[PDB]
């Protein structure tokens, strides 16, 4: 049941056109799920994220994920109890793979999205943390397996190379990750036209995430659902 997810990068409660009326619009246009990525000053970060969950939960009935600087279980728990359906963790998850299990045991595995940012380094796929500032030296191959074994429910796969380029998704990497795990894969980064979405689902993606191409209105998601369904992709329309 392939999903079209819209990602909303947000700072201090604004998109980087508040996050709520924007996701409001997306819930109506036909978006299946939302993702909110907060880049707030860390001293106001916890309160701003909680407030954002509140206001989006008050008017949006489709699943939404919130992430970005979620460092422990208490932050994850309060964001879920406040109205979020899933949390995404990357850096805390990498530095502490136990955290996947910890969130998953209270909120189920389906409540834990692990965001994997990967990049080619010397011919190998490698996991990056701190928003692509740190090469962890961990092979994406090894980290994907461990992520599922720890109890994750979904993997948000972003190619740092092809992210924000509009020149197509990283189908070689999706195909690389696809035989390694069972979890739904959310491909993020690269899509700049509808054909890139089809290419992503053929690679093995269970869901497509785009941020810039939806906001700038380069792609309509009704049009895009029509298109993919036309060419055999099982989308909910």
PDB file of N, CA, C and O in Angstrom, residues 7-49:
ATOM      1  N   UNK A   7       7.374  15.870   3.589  1.00  0.00           N
ATOM      2  CA  UNK A   7       8.262  16.227   4.687  1.00  0.00           C
ATOM      3  C   UNK A   7       8.290  17.741   4.845  1.00  0.00           C
ATOM      4  O   UNK A   7       8.572  18.464   3.881  1.00  0.00           O
ATOM      5  N   UNK A   8       8.077  18.172   6.079  1.00  0.00           N
ATOM      6  CA  UNK A   8       8.059  19.564   6.434  1.00  0.00           C
ATOM      7  C   UNK A   8       9.143  19.942   7.394  1.00  0.00           C
ATOM      8  O   UNK A   8       9.018  19.728   8.575  1.00  0.00           O
ATOM      9  N   UNK A   9      10.222  20.495   6.885  1.00  0.00           N
ATOM     10  CA  UNK A   9      11.271  20.983   7.767  1.00  0.00           C
ATOM     11  C   UNK A   9      10.789  22.268   8.436  1.00  0.00           C
ATOM     12  O   UNK A   9      10.302  23.183   7.767  1.00  0.00           O
ATOM     13  N   UNK A  10      10.914  22.328   9.755  1.00  0.00           N
ATOM     14  CA  UNK A  10      10.329  23.396  10.551  1.00  0.00           C
ATOM     15  C   UNK A  10      11.359  23.913  11.543  1.00  0.00           C
ATOM     16  O   UNK A  10      12.193  23.155  12.048  1.00  0.00           O
ATOM     17  N   UNK A  11      11.303  25.223  11.805  1.00  0.00           N
ATOM     18  CA  UNK A  11      12.188  25.889  12.755  1.00  0.00           C
ATOM     19  C   UNK A  11      11.386  26.916  13.534  1.00  0.00           C
ATOM     20  O   UNK A  11      10.720  27.766  12.939  1.00  0.00           O
ATOM     21  N   UNK A  12      11.463  26.835  14.866  1.00  0.00           N
ATOM     22  CA  UNK A  12      10.771  27.774  15.753  1.00  0.00           C
ATOM     23  C   UNK A  12       9.279  27.849  15.429  1.00  0.00           C
ATOM     24  O   UNK A  12       8.648  28.900  15.573  1.00  0.00           O
ATOM     25  N   UNK A  13       8.710  26.733  14.975  1.00  0.00           N
ATOM     26  CA  UNK A  13       7.294  26.661  14.679  1.00  0.00           C
ATOM     27  C   UNK A  13       6.885  27.175  13.318  1.00  0.00           C
ATOM     28  O   UNK A  13       5.692  27.405  13.091  1.00  0.00           O
ATOM     29  N   UNK A  14       7.836  27.378  12.413  1.00  0.00           N
ATOM     30  CA  UNK A  14       7.565  27.841  11.062  1.00  0.00           C
ATOM     31  C   UNK A  14       8.262  26.911  10.085  1.00  0.00           C
ATOM     32  O   UNK A  14       9.273  26.289  10.421  1.00  0.00           O
ATOM     33  N   UNK A  15       7.719  26.810   8.870  1.00  0.00           N
ATOM     34  CA  UNK A  15       8.424  26.070   7.829  1.00  0.00           C
ATOM     35  C   UNK A  15       9.672  26.854   7.434  1.00  0.00           C
ATOM     36  O   UNK A  15       9.712  28.090   7.531  1.00  0.00           O
ATOM     37  N   UNK A  16      10.710  26.137   6.998  1.00  0.00           N
ATOM     38  CA  UNK A  16      12.057  26.709   6.987  1.00  0.00           C
ATOM     39  C   UNK A  16      12.227  27.683   5.829  1.00  0.00           C
ATOM     40  O   UNK A  16      12.507  28.872   6.030  1.00  0.00           O
ATOM     41  N   UNK A  17       1.672  29.938   5.923  1.00  0.00           N
ATOM     42  CA  UNK A  17       2.462  28.751   5.679  1.00  0.00           C
ATOM     43  C   UNK A  17       3.151  28.330   6.959  1.00  0.00           C
ATOM     44  O   UNK A  17       4.373  28.155   7.011  1.00  0.00           O
ATOM     45  N   UNK A  18       2.365  28.223   8.020  1.00  0.00           N
ATOM     46  CA  UNK A  18       2.778  27.539   9.223  1.00  0.00           C
ATOM     47  C   UNK A  18       2.730  26.037   8.968  1.00  0.00           C
ATOM     48  O   UNK A  18       2.112  25.582   8.001  1.00  0.00           O
ATOM     49  N   UNK A  19       3.388  25.238   9.807  1.00  0.00           N
ATOM     50  CA  UNK A  19       3.402  23.789   9.550  1.00  0.00           C
ATOM     51  C   UNK A  19       2.019  23.158   9.543  1.00  0.00           C
ATOM     52  O   UNK A  19       1.816  22.150   8.851  1.00  0.00           O
ATOM     53  N   UNK A  20       1.057  23.730  10.274  1.00  0.00           N
ATOM     54  CA  UNK A  20      -0.234  23.073  10.456  1.00  0.00           C
ATOM     55  C   UNK A  20      -1.125  23.253   9.234  1.00  0.00           C
ATOM     56  O   UNK A  20      -1.635  22.279   8.672  1.00  0.00           O
ATOM     57  N   UNK A  21      -1.345  24.496   8.807  1.00  0.00           N
ATOM     58  CA  UNK A  21      -2.170  24.723   7.624  1.00  0.00           C
ATOM     59  C   UNK A  21      -1.533  24.115   6.385  1.00  0.00           C
ATOM     60  O   UNK A  21      -2.238  23.768   5.432  1.00  0.00           O
ATOM     61  N   UNK A  22      -0.209  23.977   6.380  1.00  0.00           N
ATOM     62  CA  UNK A  22       0.453  23.329   5.258  1.00  0.00           C
ATOM     63  C   UNK A  22       0.170  21.831   5.255  1.00  0.00           C
ATOM     64  O   UNK A  22      -0.234  21.266   4.230  1.00  0.00           O
ATOM     65  N   UNK A  23       0.380  21.169   6.393  1.00  0.00           N
ATOM     66  CA  UNK A  23      -0.012  19.777   6.502  1.00  0.00           C
ATOM     67  C   UNK A  23      -1.508  19.585   6.384  1.00  0.00           C
ATOM     68  O   UNK A  23      -1.963  18.565   5.864  1.00  0.00           O
ATOM     69  N   UNK A  24      -2.289  20.553   6.875  1.00  0.00           N
ATOM     70  CA  UNK A  24      -3.728  20.589   6.627  1.00  0.00           C
ATOM     71  C   UNK A  24      -4.017  20.449   5.142  1.00  0.00           C
ATOM     72  O   UNK A  24      -4.791  19.585   4.717  1.00  0.00           O
ATOM     73  N   UNK A  25      -3.391  21.310   4.341  1.00  0.00           N
ATOM     74  CA  UNK A  25      -3.563  21.269   2.894  1.00  0.00           C
ATOM     75  C   UNK A  25      -3.143  19.918   2.325  1.00  0.00           C
ATOM     76  O   UNK A  25      -3.812  19.370   1.440  1.00  0.00           O
ATOM     77  N   UNK A  26      -2.042  19.358   2.829  1.00  0.00           N
ATOM     78  CA  UNK A  26      -1.541  18.093   2.302  1.00  0.00           C
ATOM     79  C   UNK A  26      -2.471  16.934   2.637  1.00  0.00           C
ATOM     80  O   UNK A  26      -2.670  16.037   1.810  1.00  0.00           O
ATOM     81  N   UNK A  27      -3.016  16.910   3.861  1.00  0.00           N
ATOM     82  CA  UNK A  27      -3.984  15.875   4.213  1.00  0.00           C
ATOM     83  C   UNK A  27      -5.152  15.868   3.237  1.00  0.00           C
ATOM     84  O   UNK A  27      -5.690  14.803   2.914  1.00  0.00           O
ATOM     85  N   UNK A  28      -5.532  17.042   2.733  1.00  0.00           N
ATOM     86  CA  UNK A  28      -6.648  17.166   1.800  1.00  0.00           C
ATOM     87  C   UNK A  28      -6.278  16.808   0.373  1.00  0.00           C
ATOM     88  O   UNK A  28      -7.081  16.181  -0.327  1.00  0.00           O
ATOM     89  N   UNK A  29      -5.085  17.202  -0.076  1.00  0.00           N
ATOM     90  CA  UNK A  29      -4.696  17.010  -1.472  1.00  0.00           C
ATOM     91  C   UNK A  29      -4.541  15.529  -1.782  1.00  0.00           C
ATOM     92  O   UNK A  29      -4.707  15.104  -2.933  1.00  0.00           O
ATOM     93  N   UNK A  30      -4.242  14.719  -0.768  1.00  0.00           N
ATOM     94  CA  UNK A  30      -4.134  13.285  -0.939  1.00  0.00           C
ATOM     95  C   UNK A  30      -2.869  12.677  -0.363  1.00  0.00           C
ATOM     96  O   UNK A  30      -2.584  11.500  -0.609  1.00  0.00           O
ATOM     97  N   UNK A  31      -2.098  13.466   0.395  1.00  0.00           N
ATOM     98  CA  UNK A  31      -0.907  12.944   1.055  1.00  0.00           C
ATOM     99  C   UNK A  31      -1.295  11.896   2.092  1.00  0.00           C
ATOM    100  O   UNK A  31      -2.262  12.062   2.847  1.00  0.00           O
ATOM    101  N   UNK A  32      -0.538  10.799   2.125  1.00  0.00           N
ATOM    102  CA  UNK A  32      -0.875   9.689   3.008  1.00  0.00           C
ATOM    103  C   UNK A  32      -0.354   9.911   4.420  1.00  0.00           C
ATOM    104  O   UNK A  32      -1.025   9.551   5.393  1.00  0.00           O
ATOM    105  N   UNK A  33       0.835  10.493   4.551  1.00  0.00           N
ATOM    106  CA  UNK A  33       1.472  10.679   5.845  1.00  0.00           C
ATOM    107  C   UNK A  33       2.315  11.943   5.809  1.00  0.00           C
ATOM    108  O   UNK A  33       2.717  12.417   4.744  1.00  0.00           O
ATOM    109  N   UNK A  34       2.593  12.482   6.987  1.00  0.00           N
ATOM    110  CA  UNK A  34       3.427  13.665   7.105  1.00  0.00           C
ATOM    111  C   UNK A  34       4.674  13.342   7.914  1.00  0.00           C
ATOM    112  O   UNK A  34       4.724  12.361   8.659  1.00  0.00           O
ATOM    113  N   UNK A  35       5.696  14.170   7.734  1.00  0.00           N
ATOM    114  CA  UNK A  35       6.907  14.109   8.541  1.00  0.00           C
ATOM    115  C   UNK A  35       7.322  15.534   8.868  1.00  0.00           C
ATOM    116  O   UNK A  35       7.371  16.391   7.980  1.00  0.00           O
ATOM    117  N   UNK A  36       7.602  15.787  10.145  1.00  0.00           N
ATOM    118  CA  UNK A  36       8.004  17.100  10.629  1.00  0.00           C
ATOM    119  C   UNK A  36       9.414  16.991  11.184  1.00  0.00           C
ATOM    120  O   UNK A  36       9.653  16.233  12.131  1.00  0.00           O
ATOM    121  N   UNK A  37      10.343  17.747  10.602  1.00  0.00           N
ATOM    122  CA  UNK A  37      11.746  17.725  10.998  1.00  0.00           C
ATOM    123  C   UNK A  37      12.105  19.088  11.570  1.00  0.00           C
ATOM    124  O   UNK A  37      12.152  20.080  10.835  1.00  0.00           O
ATOM    125  N   UNK A  38      12.377  19.127  12.873  1.00  0.00           N
ATOM    126  CA  UNK A  38      12.608  20.374  13.587  1.00  0.00           C
ATOM    127  C   UNK A  38      14.101  20.655  13.711  1.00  0.00           C
ATOM    128  O   UNK A  38      14.889  19.758  14.025  1.00  0.00           O
ATOM    129  N   UNK A  39      14.481  21.905  13.454  1.00  0.00           N
ATOM    130  CA  UNK A  39      15.876  22.339  13.484  1.00  0.00           C
ATOM    131  C   UNK A  39      16.034  23.515  14.450  1.00  0.00           C
ATOM    132  O   UNK A  39      16.850  24.418  14.228  1.00  0.00           O
ATOM    133  N   UNK A  40      15.253  23.505  15.531  1.00  0.00           N
ATOM    134  CA  UNK A  40      15.155  24.624  16.461  1.00  0.00           C
ATOM    135  C   UNK A  40      16.383  24.722  17.368  1.00  0.00           C
ATOM    136  O   UNK A  40      17.040  23.719  17.667  1.00  0.00           O
ATOM    137  N   UNK A  41      16.710  25.960  17.764  1.00  0.00           N
ATOM    138  CA  UNK A  41      17.588  26.243  18.894  1.00  0.00           C
ATOM    139  C   UNK A  41      17.280  25.301  20.044  1.00  0.00           C
ATOM    140  O   UNK A  41      16.128  25.188  20.475  1.00  0.00           O
ATOM    141  N   UNK A  42      18.313  24.623  20.549  1.00  0.00           N
ATOM    142  CA  UNK A  42      18.095  23.494  21.451  1.00  0.00           C
ATOM    143  C   UNK A  42      17.452  23.882  22.780  1.00  0.00           C
ATOM    144  O   UNK A  42      16.875  23.009  23.442  1.00  0.00           O
ATOM    145  N   UNK A  43      17.525  25.156  23.185  1.00  0.00           N
ATOM    146  CA  UNK A  43      16.987  25.535  24.490  1.00  0.00           C
ATOM    147  C   UNK A  43      15.466  25.669  24.440  1.00  0.00           C
ATOM    148  O   UNK A  43      14.776  25.423  25.437  1.00  0.00           O
ATOM    149  N   UNK A  44      14.922  26.079  23.299  1.00  0.00           N
ATOM    150  CA  UNK A  44      13.480  26.078  23.077  1.00  0.00           C
ATOM    151  C   UNK A  44      12.993  24.841  22.320  1.00  0.00           C
ATOM    152  O   UNK A  44      11.801  24.744  22.009  1.00  0.00           O
ATOM    153  N   UNK A  45      13.880  23.887  22.042  1.00  0.00           N
ATOM    154  CA  UNK A  45      13.557  22.829  21.091  1.00  0.00           C
ATOM    155  C   UNK A  45      12.466  21.904  21.622  1.00  0.00           C
ATOM    156  O   UNK A  45      11.494  21.611  20.913  1.00  0.00           O
ATOM    157  N   UNK A  46      12.604  21.436  22.865  1.00  0.00           N
ATOM    158  CA  UNK A  46      11.650  20.460  23.389  1.00  0.00           C
ATOM    159  C   UNK A  46      10.246  21.046  23.473  1.00  0.00           C
ATOM    160  O   UNK A  46       9.271  20.387  23.094  1.00  0.00           O
ATOM    161  N   UNK A  47      10.125  22.288  23.945  1.00  0.00           N
ATOM    162  CA  UNK A  47       8.809  22.905  24.069  1.00  0.00           C
ATOM    163  C   UNK A  47       8.207  23.194  22.698  1.00  0.00           C
ATOM    164  O   UNK A  47       7.010  22.970  22.481  1.00  0.00           O
ATOM    165  N   UNK A  48       9.026  23.668  21.757  1.00  0.00           N
ATOM    166  CA  UNK A  48       8.521  23.982  20.424  1.00  0.00           C
ATOM    167  C   UNK A  48       8.018  22.731  19.713  1.00  0.00           C
ATOM    168  O   UNK A  48       6.976  22.761  19.047  1.00  0.00           O
ATOM    169  N   UNK A  49       8.743  21.617  19.845  1.00  0.00           N
ATOM    170  CA  UNK A  49       8.306  20.385  19.199  1.00  0.00           C
ATOM    171  C   UNK A  49       7.007  19.873  19.816  1.00  0.00           C
ATOM    172  O   UNK A  49       6.085  19.474  19.094  1.00  0.00           O
TER     173      UNK A  49
END
